[PDB]
From a paper:
Consistent with this idea, this backpack module and h45 are flexible and unresolved in state 1, whereas in state 2, these elements have been docked onto the particle. Docking of the backpack module and 3′ rRNA stabilization results in platform compaction and rRNA ordering similar to that observed in humans. Given the unique way in which yeast mito r-proteins mS42 and mS43 stabilize the 15S rRNA 3′ end from state 2 onwards, it appears that these mito r-proteins have functionally replaced human assembly factors ERAL1 and RBFA. In states 1 and 2, the pentatricopeptide repeat protein Ccm1 localizes to the 5′ precursor of the 15S rRNA in a position that is subsequently occupied by mS47 both in state 3 and in the mature yeast mtSSU. Ccm1 uses structure and sequence-specific RNA recognition, binding to a single-stranded region of the precursor and specifically recognizing bases −6 to −1. Ccm1 is therefore in the unique position to chaperone [name] pre-rRNA in a co-transcriptional manner similarly to eukaryotic ribosome assembly factors binding to other 5′ precursor elements. The exchange of Ccm1 for mS47 is coupled to the irreversible removal of precursor rRNA that is accompanied by conformational changes of the mito r-proteins uS5m and mS26m, and additional ordering of a flexible linker of mS45 in state 3 that is previously absent in state 2.
[name] ribosomes (mitoribosomes) synthesize proteins encoded within the [name] genome that are assembled into oxidative phosphorylation complexes. Biogenesis of the mitoribosome requires trans-acting assembly factors that chaperone rRNA folding and guide mito r-protein incorporation. Here we used cryo-electron microscopy to determine nine structures of native yeast and human mitoribosomal small subunit assembly intermediates, illuminating the mechanistic basis for how GTPases are used to control early steps of decoding centre formation, how initial rRNA folding and processing events are mediated, and how mitoribosomal proteins have active roles during assembly. Furthermore, this series of intermediates from two species with divergent mitoribosomal architecture uncovers both conserved principles and species-specific adaptations that govern the maturation of mitoribosomal small subunits in eukaryotes.
Numbering used by the authors:
A (entry chain 2): 30 to 128
B (entry chain D): 2 to 76, 88 to 205, 372 to 486
C (entry chain L): 78 to 149
D (entry chain V): 2 to 159
E (entry chain P): 2 to 106, 110 to 120
F (entry chain 6): 27 to 222, 291 to 345
The structure:
RNA sequence: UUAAGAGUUAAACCUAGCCAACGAUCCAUAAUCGAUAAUGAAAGUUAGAACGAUCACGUUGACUCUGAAAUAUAGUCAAUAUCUAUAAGAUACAGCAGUGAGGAAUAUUGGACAAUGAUCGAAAGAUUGAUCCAGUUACUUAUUAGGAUGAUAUAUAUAUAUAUAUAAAUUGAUUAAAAAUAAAAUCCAUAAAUAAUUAAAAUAAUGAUAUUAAUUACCAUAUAUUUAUAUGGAUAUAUAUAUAUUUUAAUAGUCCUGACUAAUAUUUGUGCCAGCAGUCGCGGUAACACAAAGAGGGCGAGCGUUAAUCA
């Protein structure tokens, strides 16, 4: 069933803004309808055009909202500035000598 | 499986698991399998050829070799042990259908299974290679069995021509009866071995020309009315069933009408129960086959060693 | 009998019989050699494969085309 | 495929099942008696003779079998907490429940394993005793045949 | 999870048709390597239910074969079961709600029943 | 010695003479036409012995050896009719004594070459209904009825199942006129039989759960899929079975 | 010295021993094995790809720290080979794809962490070429790859063996010489499509596979036990309602026919040539063996052949 929009996240626009990971580009897909966002399963989000990662993340955060768990942006893991562990040594050697 | 090719060739004279008229003639004229003046390899090859032409022809040779079981089962006369060479094929669903007289041939049984017309214990089975166990109940859609055992449904044109001929012959008989009722009554009683109103009761029938009547079935249905054939075209009493509608058995059905010993059949419902695997007992083998024991012996010797 | 000496990729030099009614094998030609001796030729223990390498299949072959590389 | 005929025609292998009790228990009287029994003396036996010396650094006798005591193993391996009284903790209740279940499971497993071993020992005793009374039965049967002794000398007896 | 000894699922079967062995395994061995023991089998595909059986009200059944005495022993000595294995054991009654998780956890339509 | 032997009839038949060049016929086709007899405008072969099914509860099986290939009778009088030099069918000179003197066993033998093959007797509907009453209503065991009627237990159980199914079909009016005709006809074509523990846990089910776990007790060392077991997927001994739905699954 | 025995290593002092024609030492070769694969009646024999167990290695050799355990895919040193950053630098794809070479010959520079595992984190969660899926490839194995009927066209006039005419009739052949029920034609189906719906792999939620499998040919419900008749939403029609209610197929190669070794219906070209051949062997007008036609016999999405293994 539909959760009721909260003052913290009044609209699906604000929801996509908060969850992040470039989910803001999906605003037109949902047309700012709470009911559509909270009844649309994975097959529908696929036929709309949402990619696999985006629809999985959106369904995860929608379930979190149903269960009132925090829906803040989870920044994805990134390789270190000095490169991956396997490439860390060569990249560090290059960076040190160059600068 | 193998593609059906020259299964009824009169020259080759092979007997097939089928109710064909040509298969009937091949079985009739065969006599027996000639094994005289042949080396052991030639005898084995002839026996293999004939028995595999009858038993499981549609199976590929390698598949049959894999399916071949070098053992035999049995339960005063001598028990024909080696007629059980092909008993393993008898538990297959298509073979069971054929032996239950629910299909005209094993190929037609395969098509019936593949098209979803067959059930085994209430669940639809679409695989002819399905193997039945003792006590298994299988059933066929009644229309398919009626089509397999019933005569072919004529087309509109052919039945219209047959009706033309029937009307013509009825008019001829009516003329003969009216002109000379004496001799007609005498002939009728002789064939069985007076009142003049009888010849008055007979009525001519309007001749029909098919050129104007083609393409309209209800017109012909209403126009054609013979004392046996009232208000329908020949063989098309209700042209929506897949068989000769006034249901009569297919021609040449009695030669192949064999009741199995391992299946129990209810033809009202088109159901059957697989009682057991066929077995050999003193003086009898439950594996229906048109070849005598030596032929099966030689085939078994062939398939024990793979034709070595 | 049409045959040819062939040096194989492993260094061995053998004599290979050339089957078929006609052949276009010539020196420097790339061929494929399989086993099977020519019975009436002593020392020729190998055959050349028609329709493989630089050796074409038999021209105008109707029967046993697969054994001679012919296509139809 | 051939070797599977030895193992019941089962293809593939399971890992060898582990023994819950690594060493024999102290309630297995027969094993202790065999261990404690006088070792067979001499070469058909297993031990050094009285007069012969062993190598300087070696041990004359093998290490003695450590007979597990199930009560001691349970007490040392899984000991009930001394401090029964405690206050409310969100994870403490869960940890206590898990610890209680694990203790119960291990205690139950050990005790049932010991009972199982003793039951097999009793079963073997019954088997052997029944076989010995079967020998007594043929003793009864033979005397019937040889109650017919005319005390003349026969060839089958020769 | 944690610990050297872990009760987990090793995948057997064929592509698109998974079956599993519930096994006690060393944490550092491969998933399908030979384990310390094979405690059981698990078939994740529910039993098919006919439409008429749906009218009857029968529910699809997922089949697990398990050694209950030995699994309890391995839980006692400190074996750590995986999440899916933890769920499987909980439904069997080997483990209680103490092994649950916040995400996992409602009305009971059928209660766990033990019959020979 | 072995050679291709065209399967000509073993019995005497009228071989082709000089042929008009465009006939393009064969002796085999002429033998088939002689065996079949004249064809009707309706397509039938009334002259043939076996064209029409029997109705006297005695099967009509081919007897090419006894009748020496003469398989044409008058459809009504059922007297033999042989081909004649004029081309017409007519009475034979001497009637075959073999066809009057036919052993009772041979009449139930479908195929002339195989004596061991024989047709099975068909149980009468009254006997089937009596068996149904004896088993289901009177509570008799399959053993007692099997001994009583000289029947076998699997056949008795199959008869019970079939009579129950027939009762259901008659309840739903599924049996039709054509089916009744087909059953009746095939009934008269055959001879008629003459009477004289493991602990199991069913798991807790919660609303929204689509399945219920079933746990069976098993013994370690015997439960599990073995490691290193032989793979027969690419071998002729590949193991195939059928699902509960009826689909094909590799085992 | 080790946690630990021992010429295992290092030192010292004694004895003269130790192995070996039932094969030492040396050389060549080789990863080993199974409840794995092949084969055989079996003993055995072969393989060690695939599933599984053990070992060894991560370009080569030695040593060192840490550690319970490493001569570690670590570090140091050197050897080889490359790249730049020219430094008491980095890298070595026997990790996944992929490229070049070698070879008769062995694929995607793919999708996802949905499932099962693994690492980190208290958790939220993050990573995962392990893994799971898909792609290529008849490399192998299995199911399908359509059944029944069917030897001719017209014209004549409660019975029923309908009979007469004419016309045609492909290849071979003049009757046991066939191709051939093979074709055509007819009857009845289903696959595919087109529509709806729709599981399961997974649940608290998350599905890459996915244009999912499966079901029905309008859709539900309402009773009976899959087939029925009903009630209601579809449906064009004609004139709410009598009616019907998507469409629909067919698609085989390859070898051989003297004997071993299954293949009789016969002909043509060549002429010890061209050629065939596993063995015997055939080919000089009369070729069952060469190259073909007809017919025929095997296996069949495979067939043959070469290389091997067992018997
Ligand atoms: Mg972060
Ligand atoms: Mg953790
Ligand atoms: Mg021959
Ligand atoms: Mg020392
Ligand atoms: Mg030494
Ligand atoms: Mg020294
Ligand atoms: Mg030596
Ligand atoms: Mg090596
Ligand atoms: Mg090696
Ligand atoms: Mg391997
Ligand atoms: Mg070896
Ligand atoms: Mg490999
Ligand atoms: Mg190393
Ligand atoms: Mg190294
Ligand atoms: Mg390298
Ligand atoms: Mg690579
Ligand atoms: Mg190359
Ligand atoms: Mg993952
Ligand atoms: Mg990836
Ligand atoms: Mg001609
Ligand atoms: Mg040739
Ligand atoms: Mg010639
Ligand atoms: Mg030859
Ligand atoms: Mg030739
Ligand atoms: Mg030809
Ligand atoms: Mg295949």
């Amino acid at each position: 069933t539909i959760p009721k929009p909260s003052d913290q996240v009044p609209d699906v626009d604000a929801f996509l803004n908060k969850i992040g990971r470039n989910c803001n580009e999906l605003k037109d897909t949902f047309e700012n309808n709470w009911n559509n966002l909270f009844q649309w399963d994975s097959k529908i989000l696929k036929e709309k055009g949402v990619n696999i990662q985006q629809r999985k993340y959106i369904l995860k955060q929608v379930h979190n909202y149903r269960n009132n768990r925090p829906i803040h942006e989870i920044k994805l893991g990134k390789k270190s500035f000095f490169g991956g562990e396997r490439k860390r040594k060569a990249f560090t050697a290059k960076w040190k000598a160059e600068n | 499986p193998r593609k059906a090719n020259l299964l009824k060739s009169l020259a080759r004279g092979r007997v097939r698991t089928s109710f064909n008229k040509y298969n009937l003639f091949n079985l009739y004229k065969k006599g027996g399998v000639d094994l005289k003046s042949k080396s052991l390899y030639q005898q084995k090859w002839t026996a293999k050829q004939e028995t595999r032409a009858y038993h499981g022809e549609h199976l590929t040779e390698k598949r049959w070799q894999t399916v071949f079981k070098p053992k035999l089962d049995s339960v005063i006369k001598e028990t024909p042990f080696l007629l059980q060479t092909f008993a393993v094929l008898e538990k297959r669903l298509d073979f069971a259908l054929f032996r239950a007289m629910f299909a005209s041939s094993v190929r037609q049984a395969r098509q019936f299974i593949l098209h979803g017309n067959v059930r085994v214990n209430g669940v639809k089975i679409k695989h002819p290679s399905y193997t039945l166990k003792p006590g298994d109940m299988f059933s066929v859609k009644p229309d398919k069995v009626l089509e397999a055992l019933g005569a072919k449904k004529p087309s509109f044109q052919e039945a219209l021509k047959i009706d033309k001929t029937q009307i013509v012959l009825w008019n001829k008989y009516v003329k003969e009866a009216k002109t000379e009722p004496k001799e007609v009554w005498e002939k009728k009683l002789e064939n069985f071995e007076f009142d003049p109103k009888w010849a008055k009761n007979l009525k001519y029938h309007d001749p029909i020309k098919l050129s104007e009547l083609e393409g309209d079935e209800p017109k012909a249905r209403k126009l054609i009315n013979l004392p046996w054939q009232k208000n329908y075209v020949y063989g098309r009493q209700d042209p929506k069933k897949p068989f000769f509608t006034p249901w009569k058995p297919r021609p040449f059905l009695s030669p192949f009408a064999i009741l199995p010993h391992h299946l129990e059949i209810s033809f009202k419902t088109c159901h059957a129960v697989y009682l057991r695997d066929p077995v050999a007992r003193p003086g009898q083998s439950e594996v229906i086959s048109p070849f005598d024991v030596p032929v099966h012996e030689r085939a078994y010797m062939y398939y024990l060693r793979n034709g070595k | 009998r049409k045959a040819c000496r062939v040096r194989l990729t492993n260094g061995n030099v053998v004599s290979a019989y050339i089957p078929g009614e006609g052949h276009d094998a010539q020196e420097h030609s790339i061929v494929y050699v399989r086993g099977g001796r020519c019975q009436d030729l002593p020392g020729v223990k190998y055959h050349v494969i028609r329709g493989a390498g630089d050796l074409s299949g038999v021209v105008n072959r109707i029967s046993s085309r697969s054994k001679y590389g012919a296509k139809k | 495929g051939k070797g599977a005929a030895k193992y019941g025609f089962k293809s593939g292998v399971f890992p060898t099942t582990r023994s819950i009790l690594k060493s024999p228990t102290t309630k297995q009287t027969d094993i202790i008696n065999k261990v404690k029994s006088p070792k067979p003396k001499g070469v058909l036996g297993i031990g050094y003779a009285k007069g012969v010396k062993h190598p300087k650094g070696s041990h004359r006798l093998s290490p003695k079998v450590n007979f597990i005591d199930v009560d001691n193993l349970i007490a040392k391996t899984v000991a009930e907490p001394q401090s029964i009284k405690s206050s409310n903790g969100s994870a403490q209740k869960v940890r206590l429940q898990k610890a209680e279940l694990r203790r119960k499971f291990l205690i139950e497993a050990f005790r049932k394993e010991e009972a199982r071993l003793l039951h097999k020992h009793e079963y073997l005793q019954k088997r052997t005793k029944e076989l010995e009374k079967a020998k007594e039965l043929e003793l009864e049967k033979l005397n019937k045949e040889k109650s017919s002794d005319l005390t003349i000398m026969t060839l089958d007896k020769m | 999870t944690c610990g050297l000894v872990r009760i987990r699922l090793a995948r057997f079967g064929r592509k698109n048709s998974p079956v599993y062995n519930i096994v006690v395994a060393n944490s550092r061995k491969a998933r399908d390597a030979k384990p310390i023991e094979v405690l059981g089998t698990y078939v994740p595909v529910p039993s098919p239910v006919t439409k008429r059986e749906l009218k009857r009200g029968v529910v699809p059944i997922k089949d697990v074969k398990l050694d209950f005495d030995r699994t309890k022993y391995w839980i006692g000595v400190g074996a750590q079961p995986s999440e899916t294995v933890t769920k499987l054991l909980r439904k069997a009654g080997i483990l209680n709600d103490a092994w649950a998780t916040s995400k996992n956890s409602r009305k009971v339509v059928f209660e766990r029943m033990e019959t020979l | 010695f072995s050679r291709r032997r065209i399967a000509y009839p073993f019995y005497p038949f009228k071989k082709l003479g000089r042929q008009h060049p465009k006939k393009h016929d064969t002796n085999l086709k002429t033998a088939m036409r002689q065996f079949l007899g004249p064809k009707n405008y309706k397509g039938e072969y009334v002259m043939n012995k076996y064209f029409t099914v029997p109705t006297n509860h005695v099967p009509n099986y081919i007897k090419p050896d006894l009748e020496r290939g003469q398989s044409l009778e008058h459809p009504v009088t059922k007297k033999p009719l042989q081909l004649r030099y004029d081309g017409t069918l007519g009475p034979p000179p001497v009637e075959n004594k073999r066809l009057q003197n036919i052993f009772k066993d041979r009449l139930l033998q479908p195929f002339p070459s195989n004596p061991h093959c024989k047709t099975n007797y068909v149980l009468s509907p009254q006997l089937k209904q009596s068996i149904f009453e004896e088993i289901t209503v009177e509570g008799l065991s399959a053993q007692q009825v099997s001994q009583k009627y000289g029947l076998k237990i699997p056949r008795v159980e199959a008869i019970v199942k079939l009579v129950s199914v027939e009762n259901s079909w008659n309840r739903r009016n599924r049996v039709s006129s054509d089916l009744k005709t087909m059953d009746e006809t095939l009934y008269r074509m055959f001879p008629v039989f003459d009477s004289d523990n493991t602990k199991v846990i069913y798991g807790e089910l919660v609303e929204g759960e689509r399945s219920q776990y079933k746990f069976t007790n098993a013994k370690v060392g015997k439960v599990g899929y073995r490691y290193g077991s032989g793979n027969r997927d690419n071998k002729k001994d590949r193991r195939i079975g059928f699902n509960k739905l009826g689909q094909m699954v590799y085992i």
